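ARCHIVE ENTRY
Sequence with per-residue tokens
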Amino acid sequence: EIPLKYGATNEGKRQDPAMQKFRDNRLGAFIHWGLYAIPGGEWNGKVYGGAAEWLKSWAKVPADEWLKLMDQWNPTKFDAKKWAKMAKEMGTKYVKITTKHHEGFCLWPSKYTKYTVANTPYKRDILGELVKAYNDEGIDVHFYFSVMDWSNPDYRYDIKSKEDSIAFSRFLEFTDNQLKELATRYPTVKDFWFDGTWDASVKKNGWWTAHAEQMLKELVPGVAINSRLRADDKGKRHFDSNGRLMGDYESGYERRLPDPVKDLKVTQWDWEACMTIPENQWGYHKDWSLSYVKTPIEVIDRIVHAVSMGGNMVVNFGPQADGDFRPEEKAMATAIGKWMNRYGKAVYACDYAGFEKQDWGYYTRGKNDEVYMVVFNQPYSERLIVKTPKGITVEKATLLTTGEDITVVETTRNEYNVSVPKKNPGEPYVIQLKVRAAKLYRDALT
């Protein structure tokens, strides 16, 4: 194997209580809010179909001009308590907030740049208001942080010269300053989710990624750090040159998920997927007619899919420039909330069950060996096939919502037909088993 100084630090999954909490939470919301919310995908009369938070790029807007949006940053309708209540009602156990996106505008009053909420008409420390309000609802807060920073001229996409190295070294010190400031100002932070770390400049500075992970872990006891931050000595990202996962959890499943039959490898490590409601919009885009918009059942399927393979899922929201959420997101949060209130026993604190995937939907496993069948696709046969691992029997099935007994018929050794409920639940539903020992598009840049 390749000798490395800045490759993986963790052997298996972390099993300290902070990581157990990170994992058990399972369902999170992503909040993308920044200057991009103001134009909302439109510049000088032209609507661009690309992701709204990348509008500076699509519309070729110079840094000085883009950041002049600060003069219009005045989210009059913002209420952090209302944001927190929305998340609580959705059943989210944590929220990941954009502290600073690629544009470089900070949602907290950083001492290290003038491009912050302090220098807008609104003035208020948005991030601090959100941290307090979410925590008051018993919701953990995670910080999204973009290393790539379009507002700082010391940023480099690659290191091609001595000057480049000089400028980028200053940039990395600036980045450390902001990160230390976040960690110490808001010590209840549970996770740093890095983004914009794919450029050759960061790949050439794997040492710094390892340094940033350690620096934050020393400042915030038990903090989690995503794989997206990390590059090894050789510039290899997420997993090092010896195939070992860097950081605390894998973070490359973006608007896609691992295959339930072919990608069981993912059960070996902690991981967190993220997703958008439209095809590819993270920040506020004013026109959702431009791409397909997922229904609530489509989103719920993806949430359960992640949990069934041992991962977390984070559903994105892109708040309006005024500080409210658009009606489509309010509808989505309420719909997810309703379902989670009924069926969340099968999601929270659940994990991969070790059973062969069946067509009716997903298995999940509780902390105390409860096995849950989450049914998305109702069989005309009126029979849900369950093939158990060797040495496992099914002793009972119970409908989660009503507690009613569900008929279980052995069809052959290790195989059963679980009956569908006598009355069709009319939505994706859960059967709890008692088991026993026998005897045009753009790909996500991540």
